[PDB]
Amino acid sequence: ENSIRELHDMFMDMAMLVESQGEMIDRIEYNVEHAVDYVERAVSDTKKAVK
Amino acid sequence: MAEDADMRNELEEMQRRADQLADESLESTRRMLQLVEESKDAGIRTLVM
């Protein structure tokens, strides 16, 4: 049981760590399409600035 | 005869009980029922996330 407790420590570490990383994935979710919401929207007027 | 004998006899206790604590081994195997489920329960749903 102690050996499984050792891996259990490493695993509660693992799962709560990747959990915590999921918030950086939330900031991706911001910076994945709000980045597009600036960029693609800007090139909608620079490509049409030739007009 | 005209004989009545009504008698009694005594016991020899079995071994394997040096100290009662031995049943704590069951408290261990409780714990490795306790410390096993959350591993997979967070493992597969950690794969989900």
Swiss-Prot record, chain A:
Subcellular location(s) of the protein: Cytoplasmic vesicle, Secretory vesicle, Synaptic vesicle membrane; Cell membrane; Synapse, Synaptosome
Source superkingdom: Eukaryota
Residue location of crosslink Glycyl lysine isopeptide (Lys-Gly) (interchain with G-Cter in SUMO): 47-48, 51
Domain t-SNARE coiled-coil homology: start-end pairs: 1-49
Modifications made to the protein after synthesis: Phosphorylated by CK2. (Microbial infection) Targeted and hydrolyzed by C.botulinum neurotoxin type C (BoNT/C), which hydrolyzes the 253-Lys-|-Ala-254 bond. Cleavage inhibits neurotransmitter release.
Tissue localization of expression: Expressed predominantly in cerebral cortex, hippocampus, cerebellum, adrenal medulla and retina with weak expression detected in non-neuronal tissues.
UniProt site positions, description: (Microbial infection) Cleavage: 48-49
Quaternary data: Part of the SNARE core complex containing SNAP25, VAMP2 and STX1A; this complex constitutes the basic catalytic machinery of the complex neurotransmitter release apparatus. The SNARE complex interacts with CPLX1. Interacts with STXBP1. The interaction with STXBP1 promotes assembly of the SNARE complex. Interacts (via C-terminus) with KCNB1 (via C-terminus); the interaction increases in a calcium-dependent manner and induces a pore-independent enhancement of exocytosis in neuroendocrine cells, chromaffin cells, pancreatic beta cells and from the soma of dorsal root ganglia (DRG) neurons.
Similarity comment: family membership: Belongs to the syntaxin family.
Reported function: Plays an essential role in hormone and neurotransmitter calcium-dependent exocytosis and endocytosis. Part of the SNARE (Soluble NSF Attachment Receptor) complex composed of SNAP25, STX1A and VAMP2 which mediates the fusion of synaptic vesicles with the presynaptic plasma membrane. STX1A and SNAP25 are localized on the plasma membrane while VAMP2 resides in synaptic vesicles. The pairing of the three SNAREs from the N-terminal SNARE motifs to the C-terminal anchors leads to the formation of the SNARE complex, which brings membranes into close proximity and results in final fusion.
Stated name of the protein: Syntaxin-1A
Native species: Rattus norvegicus
UniProtKB/Swiss-Prot annotation, chain B:
Coiled coil (residue ranges): none
Region (Interaction with CENPF): 1-49
Disordered: annotated span: 1-23
Disulfide bonds: none
Post-translational modification remark: Palmitoylated. (Microbial infection) Targeted and hydrolyzed by C.botulinum neurotoxin type A (BoNT/A, botA) which hydrolyzes the 197-Gln-|-Arg-198 bond and inhibits neurotransmitter release.
Compartments, record wording: Cytoplasm, Perinuclear region; Cell membrane; Synapse, Synaptosome; Photoreceptor inner segment
Compositionally biased region (Basic and acidic residues): 1-20
Family: Belongs to the SNAP-25 family.
Function: t-SNARE involved in the molecular regulation of neurotransmitter release. May play an important role in the synaptic function of specific neuronal systems. Associates with proteins involved in vesicle docking and membrane fusion. Regulates plasma membrane recycling through its interaction with CENPF. Modulates the gating characteristics of the delayed rectifier voltage-dependent potassium channel KCNB1 in pancreatic beta cells.
Subunit structure, interactors included: Part of the SNARE core complex containing SNAP25, VAMP2 and STX1A;this complex constitutes the basic catalytic machinery of the complex neurotransmitter release apparatus. Recruited to the SNARE complex following binding of the SNARE complex component STX1A to STXBP1. This complex binds CPLX1. Found in a complex containing SYT1, SV2B and syntaxin-1. Found in a ternary complex with STX1A and VAMP8. Interacts with HSC70 and with SYT9, forming a complex with DNAJC5. The interaction with SYT9 is inhibited in presence of calcium. Isoform 1 and isoform 2 interact with BLOC1S6. Interacts with CENPF.
Protein name: Synaptosomal-associated protein 25
Source species: Rattus norvegicus
Residues of the full protein shown: 1 to 49 of 206
